[PDB]
Design an enzyme around this catalytic site. Structure first.
Site, PDB file in Angstrom:
ATOM      1  N   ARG A  26       0.833  -1.207   0.000  1.00  0.00           N
ATOM      2  CA  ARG A  26       0.000   0.000   0.000  1.00  0.00           C
ATOM      3  C   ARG A  26       0.866   1.255   0.000  1.00  0.00           C
ATOM      4  O   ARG A  26       0.478   2.298   0.533  1.00  0.00           O
ATOM      5  CB  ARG A  26      -1.009   0.013   1.161  1.00  0.00           C
ATOM      6  CG  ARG A  26      -2.193   0.944   0.932  1.00  0.00           C
ATOM      7  CD  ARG A  26      -3.496   0.280   1.346  1.00  0.00           C
ATOM      8  NE  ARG A  26      -3.457  -0.180   2.727  1.00  0.00           N
ATOM      9  CZ  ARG A  26      -4.281  -1.095   3.225  1.00  0.00           C
ATOM     10  NH1 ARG A  26      -5.198  -1.652   2.447  1.00  0.00           N
ATOM     11  NH2 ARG A  26      -4.183  -1.457   4.499  1.00  0.00           N
ATOM     12  N   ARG A  30      -3.668   6.358   1.260  1.00  0.00           N
ATOM     13  CA  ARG A  30      -4.136   7.588   1.874  1.00  0.00           C
ATOM     14  C   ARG A  30      -3.146   8.210   2.845  1.00  0.00           C
ATOM     15  O   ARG A  30      -3.357   9.362   3.229  1.00  0.00           O
ATOM     16  CB  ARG A  30      -5.457   7.335   2.606  1.00  0.00           C
ATOM     17  CG  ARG A  30      -6.611   7.093   1.661  1.00  0.00           C
ATOM     18  CD  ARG A  30      -7.875   6.739   2.422  1.00  0.00           C
ATOM     19  NE  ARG A  30      -7.816   5.383   2.959  1.00  0.00           N
ATOM     20  CZ  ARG A  30      -8.703   4.875   3.811  1.00  0.00           C
ATOM     21  NH1 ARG A  30      -9.721   5.615   4.231  1.00  0.00           N
ATOM     22  NH2 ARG A  30      -8.570   3.630   4.249  1.00  0.00           N
ATOM     23  N   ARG A  39      -7.704  11.185  -5.163  1.00  0.00           N
ATOM     24  CA  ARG A  39      -8.953  10.483  -4.893  1.00  0.00           C
ATOM     25  C   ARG A  39     -10.132  11.451  -4.813  1.00  0.00           C
ATOM     26  O   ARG A  39     -11.216  11.152  -5.329  1.00  0.00           O
ATOM     27  CB  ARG A  39      -8.805   9.652  -3.612  1.00  0.00           C
ATOM     28  CG  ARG A  39     -10.110   9.154  -2.995  1.00  0.00           C
ATOM     29  CD  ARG A  39     -10.856   8.167  -3.861  1.00  0.00           C
ATOM     30  NE  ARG A  39     -11.995   7.626  -3.118  1.00  0.00           N
ATOM     31  CZ  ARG A  39     -13.143   8.268  -2.952  1.00  0.00           C
ATOM     32  NH1 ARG A  39     -13.323   9.468  -3.499  1.00  0.00           N
ATOM     33  NH2 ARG A  39     -14.120   7.707  -2.251  1.00  0.00           N
ATOM     34  N   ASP A  76      -6.985  -3.567  -7.977  1.00  0.00           N
ATOM     35  CA  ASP A  76      -7.638  -4.348  -6.938  1.00  0.00           C
ATOM     36  C   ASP A  76      -7.667  -5.788  -7.412  1.00  0.00           C
ATOM     37  O   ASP A  76      -7.719  -6.036  -8.613  1.00  0.00           O
ATOM     38  CB  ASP A  76      -9.069  -3.845  -6.688  1.00  0.00           C
ATOM     39  CG  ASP A  76      -9.654  -4.347  -5.386  1.00  0.00           C
ATOM     40  OD1 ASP A  76     -10.121  -5.504  -5.345  1.00  0.00           O
ATOM     41  OD2 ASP A  76      -9.640  -3.585  -4.394  1.00  0.00           O
ATOM     42  N   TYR A 153     -14.599 -13.972  -2.201  1.00  0.00           N
ATOM     43  CA  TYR A 153     -15.369 -12.755  -2.445  1.00  0.00           C
ATOM     44  C   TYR A 153     -16.529 -13.021  -3.395  1.00  0.00           C
ATOM     45  O   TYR A 153     -17.617 -12.471  -3.216  1.00  0.00           O
ATOM     46  CB  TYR A 153     -14.471 -11.650  -3.012  1.00  0.00           C
ATOM     47  CG  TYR A 153     -13.572 -10.985  -1.995  1.00  0.00           C
ATOM     48  CD1 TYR A 153     -14.042  -9.971  -1.175  1.00  0.00           C
ATOM     49  CD2 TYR A 153     -12.233 -11.364  -1.876  1.00  0.00           C
ATOM     50  CE1 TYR A 153     -13.203  -9.359  -0.235  1.00  0.00           C
ATOM     51  CE2 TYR A 153     -11.395 -10.759  -0.948  1.00  0.00           C
ATOM     52  CZ  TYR A 153     -11.884  -9.759  -0.136  1.00  0.00           C
ATOM     53  OH  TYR A 153     -11.052  -9.162   0.790  1.00  0.00           O
TER      54      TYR A 153
HETATM   55 CL   LIG Z   1       0.393  -2.934  -2.447  1.00  0.00          CL
HETATM   56 CL   LIG Z   2      -5.170   3.624   2.057  1.00  0.00          CL
END
Ligand SMILES: [Cl-]
Ligand SMILES: [Cl-]
Length: 355
Positions: A26, A30, A39, A76, A153
C-alpha cells in the site's frame, strides 16, 4: 528502456545485490496527501483504478518521494470477478460488494475467462503506461488474487468474517466449487500472463484468505490452484525469468508446501520470524517481508533498529548471507502513518544492508 535498478528482480531470484531492495504494501495509499487529493478529484476508488492515466499517477506517487526499489500496479484483486459480470461496487466506507454473488451451479456455469485486453483493458493499459513512464528506473510488479481468495469474495458477495457460505459449498457441493476454482484459476493465469506481456516485470499472487482453511481443505481448495498457477503460467527461464511471488498471512504452517510449488519467492507477515521462515522453506525460495507496519508509529531510531532486526534475522537463517531477501511490510500502510517515517525506513534498509 533498459532497467537501471533491478535489485528487486535479482533478490527474488536469490542472486547477489549491492543492498537489500525494499518496497512497501500500500505504498500508494491515503497516508500520502497527494493520494487523497487525487482520490477527491477522481471521485471513487473505481474512478482511479479503471482509468489508466490515474492508476499510473497513483502508482508513481510514492516514487516521487521515496527511493523504493519497485512500483506495484495500482489496482484491486476484484477486477477479475468484476470483468466476469458480478458488478463490483463500493458503498462509502463499507468495503467491496458484488451485485451478483455466485451462489448456485447456474451462476458458476455462467462464468468465463475475460478477454484480457478488452474486458480488463484498463489494467493492461495502466501496465503499459506505468512501464513507459518508469522508463527503466525500477521494475513494475503486477498482481492477482489467488483463486481461493477470489472465490471467497465471489461466493460471499463481499468480505466475510467467517466465510460460512463458501465453506458450506466446499462441504456440500465440492464439485461445483472445484468448477468455480478451475475457471477462476484459468482467469488468474490469463490475467497474470497478460500483465507480463503488457510490461509487468514481477508477479505477485495474494492468497489473503487461505488461512481460514483446515490443512486438508487448504490443500484441496487453495494450494491445488496455486500449484496450477506456478505450473501453467509461462514466465521464462533462469536469470531472465519473471519472478512469481506468493503472499499469505498467518500461514507459516504452509511455508514448506508453498516453497515446493515452483514459485520464486514467498511474502509473509511478522507472525513468524524470517529465520524460522528460512528453516521451513529450505532455501528453495526468496523471502519478502516481514515488518509489522505499526513499527512506523515508533521513533525514527526505533524504526531503523527494527529494520536492522528484520534484516539480521533473515541473514541469521540464511547462513549469514543477506541475499535472497526483499524487505517489505507484512500488511499495508495505514492512512494515519507519517511519510517521514517511511523515508526513514527506506533509507535504513538500504544503509544497514550494504554488502
Ligand atoms: Cl500494495
Ligand atoms: Cl489507504
Amino acid at each position: 528502456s533498459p532497467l537501471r535498478n533491478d535489485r528487486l528482480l535479482r533478490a527474488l531470484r536469490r542472486e547477489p545485490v549491492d543492498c537489500t531492495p525494499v518496497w512497501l504494501m500500500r505504498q500508494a495509499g491515503r497516508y500520502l496527501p497527494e493520494y487523497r487529493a487525487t482520490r477527491a478529484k477522481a471521485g471513487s476508488f473505481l474512478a482511479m483504478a479503471k482509468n489508466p492515466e490515474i492508476a499510473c499517477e497513483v502508482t508513481l506517487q510514492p516514487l516521487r518521494r521515496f527511493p523504493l526499489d519497485a512500483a506495484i500496479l495500482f489496482s484491486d484483486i476484484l477486477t477479475i470477478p468484476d470483468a466476469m459480470g458480478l458488478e463490483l461496487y463500493f458503498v462509502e466506507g463499507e468495503g467491496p460488494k458484488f451485485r451478483h454473488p455466485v451462489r448456485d451451479e447456474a451462476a458458476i456455469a455462467r462464468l468465463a475467462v475475460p478477454d484480457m485486453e478488452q474486458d480488463l483493458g484498463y489494467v493492461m493499459d495502466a501496465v503499459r503506461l506505468i512501464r513507459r513512464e518508469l522508463d527503466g528506473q525500477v521494475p513494475l510488479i503486477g498482481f492477482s488474487g489467488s483463486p481461493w481468495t477470489l472465490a471467497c469474495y465471489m461466493v460471499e458477495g463481499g468480505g466475510s468474517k467467517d466465510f460460512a457460505r463458501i465453506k458450506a459449498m466446499a462441504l456440500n457441493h465440492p464439485q461445483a466449487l472445484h468448477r468455480l476454482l478451475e475457471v477462476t484459476t484459468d482467469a488468474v493465469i490469463a490475467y497474470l500472463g497478460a500483465q507480463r506481456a503488457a510490461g509487468a516485470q514481477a508477479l505477485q499472487v495474494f492468497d489473503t484468505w487461505g488461512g481460514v482453511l483446515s490443512p486438508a481443505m487448504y490443500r484441496e481448495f487453495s494450494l491445488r490452484y496455486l500449484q496450477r498457477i506456478a505450473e501453467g503460467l509461462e514466465r521464462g527461464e533462469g536469470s531472465e525469468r519473471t519472478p512469481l511471488i506468493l503472499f499469505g498471512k498467518g500461514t507459516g504452517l504452509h511455508l514448506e508446501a508453498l516453497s515446493q510449488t515452483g514459485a520464486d519467492a514467498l511474502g509473509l507477515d511478522w507472525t513468524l520470524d524470517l529465520d524460522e521462515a528460512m528453516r521451513r522453506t529450505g532455501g528453495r525460495v526468496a523471502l519478502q517481508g516481514n515488518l509489522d507496519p505499526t513499527t512506523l508509529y515508533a521513533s525514527p531510531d526505533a524504526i531503523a533498529a527494527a529494520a536492522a532486526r528484520v534484516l539480521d534475522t533473515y541473514a541469521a537463517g540464511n547462513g549469514g548471507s543477506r541475499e535472497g531477501h526483499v524487505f517489505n511490510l507484512g500488511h499495508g500502510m495505514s492512512p494515519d502513518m507519517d511519510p517521514a517515517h517511511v523515508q526513514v525506513l527506506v533509507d535504513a534498509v538500504h544503509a544497514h544492508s550494504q554488502r
